[PDB]
Amino acid sequence: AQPAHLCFRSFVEALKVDNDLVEINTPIDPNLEAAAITRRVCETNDKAPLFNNLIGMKNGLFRILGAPGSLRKSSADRYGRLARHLALPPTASMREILDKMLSASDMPPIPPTIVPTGPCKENSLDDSEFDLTELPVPLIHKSDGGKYIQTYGMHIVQSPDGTWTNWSIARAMVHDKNHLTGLVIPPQHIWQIHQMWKKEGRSDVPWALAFGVPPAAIMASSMPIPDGVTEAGYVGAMTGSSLELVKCDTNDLYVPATSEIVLEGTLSISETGPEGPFGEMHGYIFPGDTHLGAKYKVNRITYRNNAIMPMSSCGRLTDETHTMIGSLAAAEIRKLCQQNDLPITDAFAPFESQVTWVALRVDTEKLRAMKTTSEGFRKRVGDVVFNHKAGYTIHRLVLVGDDIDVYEGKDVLWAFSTRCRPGMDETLFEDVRGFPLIPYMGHGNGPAHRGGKVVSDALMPTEYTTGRNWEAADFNQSYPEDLKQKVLDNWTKMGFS
Amino acid sequence: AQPAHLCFRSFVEALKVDNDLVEINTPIDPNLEAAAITRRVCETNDKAPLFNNLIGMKNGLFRILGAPGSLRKSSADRYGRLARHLALPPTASMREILDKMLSASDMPPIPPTIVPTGPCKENSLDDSEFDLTELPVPLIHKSDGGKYIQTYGMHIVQSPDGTWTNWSIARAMVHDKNHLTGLVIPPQHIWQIHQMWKKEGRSDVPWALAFGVPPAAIMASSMPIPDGVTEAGYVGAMTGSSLELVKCDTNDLYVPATSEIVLEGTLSISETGPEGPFGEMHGYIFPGDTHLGAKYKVNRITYRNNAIMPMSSCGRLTDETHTMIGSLAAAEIRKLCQQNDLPITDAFAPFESQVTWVALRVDTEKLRAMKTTSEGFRKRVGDVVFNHKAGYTIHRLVLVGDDIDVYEGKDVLWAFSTRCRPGMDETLFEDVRGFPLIPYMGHGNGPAHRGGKVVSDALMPTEYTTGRNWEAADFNQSYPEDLKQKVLDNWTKMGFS
Numbered sequence A, B: 001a002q003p004a005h006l007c008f009r010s011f012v013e014a015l016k017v018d019n020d021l022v023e024i025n026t027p028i029d030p031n032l033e034a035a036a037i038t039r040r041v042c043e044t045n046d047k048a049p050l051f052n053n054l055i056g057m058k059n060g061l062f063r064i065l066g067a068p069g070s071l072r073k074s075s076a077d078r079y080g081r082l083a084r085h086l087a088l089p090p091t092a093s094m095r096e097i098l099d100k101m102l103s104a105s106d107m108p109p110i111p112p113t114i115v116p117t118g119p120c121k122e123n124s125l126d127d128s129e130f131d132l133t134e135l136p137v138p139l140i141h142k143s144d145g146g147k148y149i150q151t152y153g154m155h156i157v158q159s160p161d162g163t164w165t166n167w168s169i170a171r172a173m174v175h176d177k178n179h180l181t182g183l184v185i186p187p188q189h190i191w192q193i194h195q196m197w198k199k200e201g202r203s204d205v206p207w208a209l210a211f212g213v214p215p216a217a218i219m220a221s222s223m224p225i226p227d228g229v230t231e232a233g234y235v236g237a238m239t240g241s242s243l244e245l246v247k248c249d250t251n252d253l254y255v256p257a258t259s260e261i262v263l264e265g266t267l268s269i270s271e272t273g274p275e276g277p278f279g280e281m282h283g284y285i286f287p288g289d290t291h292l293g294a295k296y297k298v299n300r301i302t303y304r305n306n307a308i309m310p311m312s313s314c315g316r317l318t319d320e321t322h323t324m325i326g327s328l329a330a331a332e333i334r335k336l337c338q339q340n341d342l343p344i345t346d347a348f349a350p351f352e353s354q355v356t357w358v359a360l361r362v363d364t365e366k367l368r369a370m371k372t373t374s375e376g377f378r379k380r381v382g383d384v385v386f387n388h389k390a391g392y393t394i395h396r397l398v399l400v401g402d403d404i405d406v407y408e409g410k411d412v413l414w415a416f417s418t419r420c421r422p423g424m425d426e427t428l429f430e431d432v433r434g435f436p437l438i439p440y441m442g443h444g445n446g447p448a449h450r451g452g453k454v455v456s457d458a459l460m461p462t463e464y465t466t467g468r469n470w471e472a473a474d475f476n477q478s479y480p481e482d483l484k485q486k487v488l489d490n491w492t493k494m495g496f497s
Ligand SMILES: Cc1cc2c3c(c1C)C(C)(C)C[C@@H](C(=O)Cc1ccccc1)N3c1c([nH]c(=O)[nH]c1=O)N2C[C@H](O)[C@H](O)[C@H](O)COP(=O)(O)O
Pocket: A150, A151, A152, A166, A167, A168, A169, A170, A171, A172, A183, A184, A185, A187, A188, A189, A190, A221, A222, A223, A224, A225, A280, A281, A312, A314, A320, A321, A324, A325, A393, A437
């Protein structure tokens, strides 16, 4: 066999073939050691670790793959892990990756295909046979409030009426032998669907959590595609293939046939339990900061022979919470802007901003034809984005003109720092949903859930009127073409590197 | 040999010895080519170029050294050029460099020593014998409004009463055979002294411009040491040695004995001429943006045999306008804060901010004892800094706690992005002097000369009260010491780089 983008086991193979995998066959402790190695990998853009000999692995549960969506060292294949989720060449640009993830947005869905069995059915454990506290679930950060089994699996929940099945990543930790607790927060789709079941009031939410799903599916799971859109059919259109799914044993949900590990059960409409703290995407943990979270009951586990659990050891740069959350949100924001008739060509969440900013590249020819001003345009952009779920995680939008490559953080920083006058060239948004996970929100001086957002206009005045009126004081723009070429051609002759 | 910090010719030797120099002995055009090579050096942190065969060099005037204060590639000796200005080991940290530049602030001055002659007297040209338009003055950027002879020399002017002699860098370009035009703007000391002569009204300002001065002198020339303080005596205290100076031939000013090239003349109290545009430190040139500047008359040139003119090809990162202007301003700001009883331990202007920000590291134990709040503390800090000349070039101050290394831009960006809530955690300053060279000031939407400043508080709430209440979600802080060491010790064994 199955292609890498359609089968996690094949994806692991692909990373090996790529010389992008280190297989660790000696015993590794899931209590911190696996996550520490993965953390170091993510901080240094090293090869992904596959822990084949995890202390506590029994009867096939489980090996761990760390850093599944993290960066490679080389510039040429920096995003190659992400490309391997999507059948793209390993040298694919971020633009190419994001365009692939947006491609299904004006295609008919390709609904999934139901097949009678698959590798995820190779082994099973009923509710007399498993204990979640006895599995080699990792402690990811030393101060975490639980062992976070769920950092890179896919929650599956369906609206009561059956018309929308959502796939998404949301964290969860082990509560006891047969329960998890996790985040289920607005405006996320798992929360939206949970609210539908709670208003109906009759039962707990049928649920499954599938780990080691098709890589193309985990990417859509991490993207804020629209309300009401079933991720499986979006992935089918993106990949050009209907995804093969098998029915759960204990409920009527459907999971990818090649899932490594599947939990089946219910998400309670009534019960909560302690959740967190967790070392999070912005780079912090607040020890002792436990709060009630949603509570999941597990009734059944099914799994592949020699099952592999993917794990995100998230925190400071760079891991899946940056490469996927930020970039995929930025992609959806780009599309949302264009659908609102805003002249945005590109969007990216700079890593340097801890993926709390999105830089929006403006087609300034189109802007000029709008015959508008900074104040008006900033407000329009911020209203569109900050009032929408796709903008949830993003607290600063930086508008830049056509000369800036938004996928290059040094260039975004240059433009922000030199073209946006603090205060005057910004519009603050206090009456929008805020992202409480940012430390200055949930642990800050103001409301955790509201405000703290800004549109920073790094468009220069003449970009709204007559056109750019500067040249950069750089090698590229400050010297004629023939001179530049001469200098390059004589560079090593003269004595330079 | 004479020591490198005391003699520019010896400094050039030192860069060669260091394998930090490329001697270009074939013909190089001062019309763009020399500056293009230097620009490329600065953008890539390559070796400094010494142009020994400059097209248009005659009778000893002149060779060019580019990139005298720019960065080296290696992290270990990144600031080695700057260290070579100061007699410091080439591996000196930025903290060490800035401490050396601040050291003379609580020492008695060591006034200069007058000697009868020096190398700067080896050759001379009277006012019948030179023509500035006939010298190989560089065109530094293709759209510059003149040939900028003066990018790394030292202007010397003295108060009418004789009590203060200032040394400073300010740009100047050739106007005609015997005149320059340049920037002389408030609140700079050359401007302050010029205003004293203008109020006296009796004559033009006696002036000299010395190129290829002692490196320790050019560093102080680039630093905003206090009003009324004679740089020569500050440099003498910093270096532990009295600087040797020779009298000008045509006026009673005194220049370093080993200056490569000296212009003697007057800075007019009445005349102006076209100046600019110039490709500037923030990374831009605005073609055609010429304005009246100060006008200098040159009466005499003296120079060393085989004179070398230093040149800054300034613009986008990284050159002297970043490494020296930003860092030296930040050093003075650190001291100014401490003298105002503010608990600041360190300051640096991040390169990523185009040296428009300064990050201020706070001793949070001291902060806690102040029993203050963010609003109050931000306002106090901003009032101190933004009302002072040392703050002139800086538009954003970022307050950070003790965990942040302000000399590491990635860590400043992380703290700013995650700990400062836009709007609420900031105080805007509109009634302070602004720096018009920033594009969003002089080419922006508001007053060029006023406002546009902000204090951004990236201190978290408990840093004012009870202490830091988080751990970073990073390898260093999220795992115990013994585990970290194990992972490091087994890193290459396991298969990692
Ligand atoms: C790639 C990744 C993604 C998330 C998360 C992590 C990783 C690796 C982990 C599990 C490592 C961290 C965790 C987070 O702590 C970060 C976070 C992000 C956004 C909201 C809350 C938490 N998390 C997560 C997340 N969404 C969350 O609702 N709680 C979560 O727990 N997300 C983001 C989420 O998938 C996206 O917002 C999707 O758009 C959601 O799908 P839809 O609702 O649009 O269908």
